[PDB]
Amino acid sequence: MYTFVVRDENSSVYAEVSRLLLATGQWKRLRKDNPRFNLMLGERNRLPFGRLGHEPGLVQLVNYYRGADKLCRKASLVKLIKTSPELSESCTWFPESYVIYPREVFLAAYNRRREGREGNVWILISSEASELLDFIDEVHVIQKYLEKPLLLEPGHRKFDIRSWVLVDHLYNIYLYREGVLRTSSEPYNSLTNHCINYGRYEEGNEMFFEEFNQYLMDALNTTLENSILLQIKHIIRSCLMCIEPAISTKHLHYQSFQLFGFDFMVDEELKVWLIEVNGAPACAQKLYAELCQGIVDVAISSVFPLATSIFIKLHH
């Protein structure tokens, strides 16, 4: 029998994962503060990482990577990219972003394009620095708003892509073969959060990969793999390997895996941009069962075995 403990009751993903483990008949959920667990589905904040790996006779796994917050916070991510040579100053795939605390770097580069007549529309989206910058004082990230988003028709609809990524204890990087397209239902005027019409062109403003592939073929004579996903795999891999020496648990007394959500936006010229990385993501409703079983298969059962894959291994 294996032991596990739940410490984030709002995790739709790991509530699904925990019910899967119990229903295997070889896992038993413990009290939330029982130290003798094999697996910890931990809280999102102040996870007691310093307490893992000190139980004699117990192999301990945790569904979070200590130090992964540096990729999953806007101010730190923007810092991490510019300051790290792996992501190499201004790489091609991250919008120009700046840390301004509620300033000098913004004015120098931005004002060049307000003079130069190239669209100066950073982002709460304005074109006047004072309008938005003085507003935020009522930390924040000032990012260029890409003014030429990819046209999606019928409907002239802006969109964003979410790919779920699982990193196991051995730092294998797994890209779930099923990504989600979150769609804006109303046309664009020269935000796609599903939290903010709905249902007109496709169910619940969620378009899938089999469908978006055919749109790209029929409309644009191209494949999803060739046009977008190749750029996505490169951005995921570059991000997660840059921080691998900082967060890997290869030689640690406890082990980490963690599921991420990557956010991309595709421009008119079919260039892929990184929006944000989310350390606690929620799967699409249709895809929950497939992904949560893949987590158990490759993240949990790999360490705790019992007695065709759904992932793409991003090689490094």
Partner: protein, 437 residues
């Protein structure tokens, strides 16, 4: 030359003291009968090894040490052991019944009956020192004597020798080799009482030593002998600068200067490499780069913690064996590229390096193989606070129900001393967090 006095309190301190002084005798060429033919100054001298040894007219070299335990069993084996002649009978002080794993009994009821005698025996050692720099105190967090009596002695030493440095070698409790359920209580009480009276404390987690013996020495069930002999190698590395000629860490004062920028944050992490089994037939000798890089592996540290998720305030590299500075600097440049080593912004990112050419000495019939080079890293990193969080959490679990507290209150202690000690621990954890993030 300024003399240093070693005080070994409780079972753990005494048995670790045995292995340390045994190792010192081998390193300095002193026989179990106290004679050192190496010493051509007969009856005295001011050599570097005279920091730890005094001389008699008969040429016997005597450790400047005192062993104290509230119960006679452990120290009696020292009186009858291989090094019987090494120590003067007055140097070994024993009580009659121990503290029963109770800090209060060690500190208050039983400890108060022997404290005056111990200080007088210590004073006899001090009066044969031309310039006493301070004390090195070996004790456990967990035991009643190692916890309660040590804090009592440290308070009186602060009063009597207020100008002298006090360093600790503290054994942090681990369930793999545990002796008592109330060890988290004893740990918090003794740490709180001793915090301002200690200038530098080297914590050794019994869990780390245990796994190192299993993993790297292939001993399935390590005994106290296995753990202590490995611990003495680390201790010998830390104290070698006091006993041999060198420019780095030559007095106890320098340990605080190099390792301790803030007084409360005075627990440096120790990492030792390489640990190789004597029974390993074929072994490939590791280079300067390999052993230095091992200093940043948590599996070689004396406490298991992640320095990547903390900040450094100081870093010392103590080498023994075939090591030259150009190899050290080339290795450091290499490690800096590949590892997460981040300092606080008000400290320079630099290493203090000391090299002793004679390689580590090993006891014949021991578990460690002879190596051609070794290193002990002393880093002051906030990551060591993980051990404080682990201990404090265990304290909270029991204390929330006042489990076993009646044993302490039964000896005169008050419930408020528990909460007072825990608040100081909570403050210590917060100091570490502010510096670390």
């Amino acid at each position: 030359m300024r003399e240093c006095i070693s005080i070994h309190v409780g079972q753990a301190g005494v048995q670790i003291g045995n292995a340390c002084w045994e190792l010192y005798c081998l390193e300095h060429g002193i026989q179990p009968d106290g004679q050192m033919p190496s010493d051509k100054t007969i009856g005295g001298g001011d050599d570097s090894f005279n920091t730890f040894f005094s001389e008699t007219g008969a040429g016997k070299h005597v450790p400047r040490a005192v062993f104290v335990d509230l119960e006679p069993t452990v120290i009696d084996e020292v009186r009858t052991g291989t090094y019987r002649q090494l120590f003067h009978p007055e140097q070994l002080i024993t009580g009659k019944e121990d503290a029963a794993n109770n800090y209060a009994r060690g500190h208050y009821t039983i400890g108060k009956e022997i404290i005056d005698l111990v200080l007088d025996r210590i004073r006899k050692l001090a009066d044969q020192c031309t310039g006493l720099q301070g004390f090195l105190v070996f004790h456990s967090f967990g035991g009643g004597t190692g916890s309660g009596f040590t804090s009592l002695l440290m308070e009186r030493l602060s009063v009597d020798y207020g100008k002298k440095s006090k360093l600790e070698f503290s054994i942090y409790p681990a369930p793999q080799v545990s002796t008592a359920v109330v060890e988290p209580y004893n740990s918090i009480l003794t740490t709180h009482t001793t915090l301002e009276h200690s200038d530098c404390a080297f914590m050794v987690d019994n869990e780390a030593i245990y796994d190192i013996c299993r993993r790297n020495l292939d001993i399935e069930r390590p005994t106290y002998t296995n753990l202590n002999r490995l611990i003495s190698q680390i201790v010998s590395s830390i104290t070698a600068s006091l006993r041999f000629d060198g420019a780095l860490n030559v007095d106890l004062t320098e340990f605080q200067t190099n390792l301790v920028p803030y007084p409360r944050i005075h627990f440096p992490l120790a990492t030792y490499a390489p640990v190789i089994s004597a029974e390993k037939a074929y072994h490939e000798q590791l280079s300067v780069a390999e052993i230095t890089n091992a200093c940043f592996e948590p599996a070689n540290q004396m406490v298991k913690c992640d320095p990547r998720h903390g900040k450094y305030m100081a870093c010392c590299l103590l080498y023994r064996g075939d090591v030259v500075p150009k190899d050290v600097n080339a290795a450091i440049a290499t490690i800096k590229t590949k590892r997460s080593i981040q300092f606080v912004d008000w400290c320079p990112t630099g290493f203090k390096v000391g090299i002793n050419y004679q390689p580590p000495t090993v006891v014949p019939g021991g578990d460690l193989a002879k190596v051609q080079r070794a290193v002990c890293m002393l880093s002051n990193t906030t990551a060591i606070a993980e051990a404080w969080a682990r201990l404090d959490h265990k304290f909270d679990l029991m204390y929330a129900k006042r489990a076993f507290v009646h044993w302490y209150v039964g000896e005169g202690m008050e419930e408020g001393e528990f909460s007072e000690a825990r608040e100081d621990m909570a403050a210590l954890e917060k100091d570490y967090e502010e510096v670390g993030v």
